[PDB]
Amino acid sequence: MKVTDVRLRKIQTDGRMKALVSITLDEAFVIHDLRVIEGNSGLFVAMPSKRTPDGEFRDIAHPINSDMRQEIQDAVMKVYDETD
Amino acid sequence: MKVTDVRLRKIQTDGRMKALVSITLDEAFVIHDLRVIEGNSGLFVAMPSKRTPDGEFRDIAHPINSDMRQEIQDAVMKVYDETDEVI
Numbered sequence: 001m002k003v004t005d006v007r008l009r010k011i012q013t014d015g016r017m018k019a020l021v022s023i024t025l026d027e028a029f030v031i032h033d034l035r036v037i038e039g040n041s042g043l044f045v046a047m048p049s050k051r052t053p054d055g056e057f058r059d060i061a062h063p064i065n066s067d068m069r070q071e072i073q074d075a076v077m078k079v080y081d082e083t084d
Numbered sequence: 085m086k087v088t089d090v091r092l093r094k095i096q097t098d099g100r101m102k103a104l105v106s107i108t109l110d111e112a113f114v115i116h117d118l119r120v121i122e123g124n125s126g127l128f129v130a131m132p133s134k135r136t137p138d139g140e141f142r143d144i145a146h147p148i149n150s151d152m153r154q155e156i157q158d159a160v161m162k163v164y165d166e167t168d169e170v171i
Contacts, residue, residue, distance in 0.1 A: 001085075001111045001112050023108075025085065025109065025112075027148070027149070028085045028147060028148060028149050028151070028152040029085060029109060029145065029146070029147055029152055030145065030146060030148055031115075031144065031145045032143075032145065033134070033142065034144070048134070048144050048145075050117070050134050050135075058116070059116050060132045060134065060144050060145070061115065061132070061144070061145055062114045062115075062118070063112065063113050063114075064108070064111065064113065064114055065112075068113065
């Protein structure tokens with residue numbers, strides 16, 4: 001439920017991919033390969049994702065509700081603004 | 085952190101990989117692509133693995149304490165052992 005740790009490195013880029021991010025949940029489980037993505041519509045945190053059995057991408061890790069999604073974004077963005 | 089939901093699909097191809105698995109943690113986060121794997125000393129649960137562009141693999145998500153590791157192994161194997169193909 002709680003994001004207890006956030007690790008990221010900012011990439012030097014004109015690319016939209018701005019950082020690779022790892023997060024820890026409740027000091028018990030880490031998820032790698034989150035991304036901070038910038039575009040003209042705003043910054044967001046993408047979950048790690050992969051191409052499925054055939055064709056499409058989906059999140060390998062996925063918060064179930066909006067509240068959890070916003071909490072991850074905020075936790076990650078705070079550290080992101082603190083970085084460099 | 086409780087593993088509250090487990091969703092399993094038995095893989096038909098008789099190899100190392102016995103099932104593909106999703107779990108829910110705390111009813112707050114779902115992790116896809118756990119794998120039931122036959123290792124040298126029995127079946128176990130492997131973590132979500134992603135192929136890198138050059139054909140290597142990255143372990144994407146994993147436990148960092150023994151309680152979490154054991155709860156995932158236990159909750160997943162429980163559901164696997166309920167499948168029709170296991171006796």
